[PDB]
Every structure is written in C-alpha cells, then in structure tokens.
Design a protein around this ligand. Structure first.
Ligand SMILES: Nc1nc2c(ncn2[C@@H]2O[C@@H]3COP(=O)(O)O[C@H]4[C@@H](F)[C@H](n5cnc6c(N)ncnc65)O[C@@H]4COP(=O)(O)O[C@H]3[C@H]2F)c(=O)[nH]1
Lengths: 170, 170
C-alpha cells in the first residue's frame, strides 16, 4: 500500500505542476530538436542511479531546461529543474528528450533497507508494479497529461537507451 | 496508512539530505543571527499555505539560504532551497530561523479532494497525526537529526508566530 501514496505524491507534488508548463519550457529551449514529452523511467527493480549516464553510456546528458520556480509550503522560489539527454545508437544521435527516473522508486528501495520502515525487501517488486499501475491510472484521467509524458517501465544483455528509443520512435 | 509512506518519503528524499549540510549552510549565511535548527510546521488540519506570511503577518520572509544541489534520479543539479524568516512580536524582531511547512501535508489534503485517491476527507486529521507520529519516530533514532530540526505540530484567537517563538525560546 505504500506505493499508492507515493504515486499520488509523485503527481500532486510534481507531475501536475511541471507537466502543464513543460511544453512552454521545451519550446523556449528549442528557440535558444528536443521532443515535447517528459520521459519517465520506472525500473521495476527500483535501482535508480543518480547519474543517468552510468546506467548506459549511450545516454549523454546535454543540458538543463529553463528552471521553473514557485513558492511552495513556505519555500520562496522552490526550483523544479529537468535535464535534456541525447540517445546514441551506433555512434549516431538517435534522439533527444527530457528524460529522468521516477524518484519515489528510490524511496521504495530505501524504505526496504530500513527495518523501522516495516517494508520487506521481498516486496520491492510488487510495490514498484503497484506504483506504476497507480501512476498510469492517475495520468490516464488527468488534464495535465495531455500527451505530455510517457512512462517507461521495464525489467532487466539489455539496453535501456534502446528502451527509450523504442517509445521515442513511436 | 498513506501517511506512513509520506513520512518515510519526507525523510529519505529530504530531511536526511539537507539536515547534514544545513549547519554549514546557515554558518555561511551568518558570515555573509539565524538560529541553527530547521523549524518544520505541521498543521494538523493540513492547511499548508504556500506563502508563509499569509498565515500570520508576524512572519516575514527575509532571505534564501545558499542553495544545495546534487544529481538525483537523473536530474543534473537538483536544487534544495530554504527560506529564512523573522518572527515579530509587538513590532520587535523576536527571532530568526529557517522555517517551513512540511510539504507532504499538502499531499494529504490534495489526496482527500480526489475521489480516485481512495482517501476520505474525514481521515485528514488522523493521517496528519500519523504523519507527525511517524516522522518524530524516524527523527528520534536518526543520525541526521543531531539537534538539527524541531517539529512544530499544532491545532487551530491563535498566533502561530507565537507558536514558533515558543519552541524558538526553548
Ligand atoms: N522544501 C523542499 N522539500 C523537498 C524538496 N525535495 C524534496 N522535498 C520533500 O520530500 C518529499 C519527497 O521528495 P522526493 O523523494 O524527491 O519525491 C518527490 C519527487 F518524486 C517529485 N518531485 C518533486 N519535486 C521535484 C523536483 N524538483 N525534481 C524531481 N522530482 C521532484 O515529487 C515527489 C514529492 O514531492 P513533494 O514536494 O510533494 O514531497 C517532497 C517534499 F516534502 C525541496 O527541494 N524543497
């Protein structure tokens, strides 16, 4: 059940705030092409490396988008920032996108290690699936998600660069 | 049960990252006095205004701390920023601190309005209490919380500026 609140946290505190202003943020960057969707990686093993290039050398960080900021819960100018990556394939620039892991999967993996969290390591995968399932339902019936992001869930030769390219080509 | 994952999310994804580097961040600001603890507001009604001055005119935003940034889940240079407030009392500067609401309480209040979230409005208060109770337990046995933050839970004439001052004077 923990994954449930995390998916809803993931949407209320993020997806529903940056998704509406995301097209305008890519358009700016293009007119100093980055594709217009926010690609979200959901590894079901919940292994979420912080540096995306260490998961695959064919994913190269290129730049940051223009920051988005707002006052939130008493923090003046809270900062939402997103990175642009190029996807390479046989030495060729095959695509460019705003690409990133779903952070809460890291929370699930950290909750598993702490004994005080009452969350067993065996349950990581079932909660990862529940997290994806719930988030896909939240986005299916959401105004914010008007074709703004694509969830990339996968299980682990294996190329993830290829995985992103698969959905990117679609 | 949703509050449980939120408290653990609140710690793994925030408290345990900024708390260790918080003393060093205040010390910098002092040597261009801000008190050395991170004061976290937990309204049990889960009403979390974004601008802290609209909850009480005696809380005046003063400045931002030096930002803290790191690579996280594929975002290059993710930004953690915190605001410094002065607490006034009969026109007098009575205190200065890094003060802020616990954001997840906003998630609880948003989850209550959405029917798809399976979270009734009657349960807001019980989950707010469960959120505070869990977070107080996580911090009690935490290395990060070596006298770094004070939880300010309250229920609602009433002065909150006075509330913060109470714990501040201690
Ligand atoms: N004042 C303050 N508080 C913070 C901060 N960072 C974390 N917190 C606290 O910790 C909770 C869990 O953080 P998380 O583990 O990163 O999970 C996040 C993440 F998955 C995504 N997200 C949000 N901003 C993003 C960004 N900028 N990039 C990527 N992703 C993001 O939405 C979740 C919930 O976001 P919420 O805010 O609703 O709840 C948060 C909040 F209470 C911070 O900079 N300043």
């Amino acid at each position: 059940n923990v994954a449930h609140g995390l998916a809803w946290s993931y949407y209320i505190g993020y997806l529903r705030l940056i998704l509406p202003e995301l097209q305008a943020r890519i358009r700016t960057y293009n007119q100093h092409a980055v594709s217009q969707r926010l690609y979200i990686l959901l590894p079901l093993d919940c292994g979420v490396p912080d540096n995306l290039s260490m998961a695959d050398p064919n994913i190269r960080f290129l730049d940051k988008l223009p920051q988005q900021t707002g006052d939130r819960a008493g923090i003046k100018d809270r900062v939402y920032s997103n990175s642009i990556y190029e996807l390479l394939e046989n030495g060729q620039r095959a695509g460019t996108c705003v690409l990133e892991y779903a952070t809460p999967l890291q929370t699930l993996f950290a909750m598993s290690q702490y004994s005080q969290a009452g969350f067993s390591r065996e349950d990581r995968l079932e909660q990862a699936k529940l997290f994806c399932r719930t988030l896909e339902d939240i986005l299916a019936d959401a105004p914010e998600s008007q074709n703004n992001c694509r969830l990339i869930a996968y299980q682990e030769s294996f190329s993830l660069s290829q995985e992103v390219l698969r959905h990117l080509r679609q």
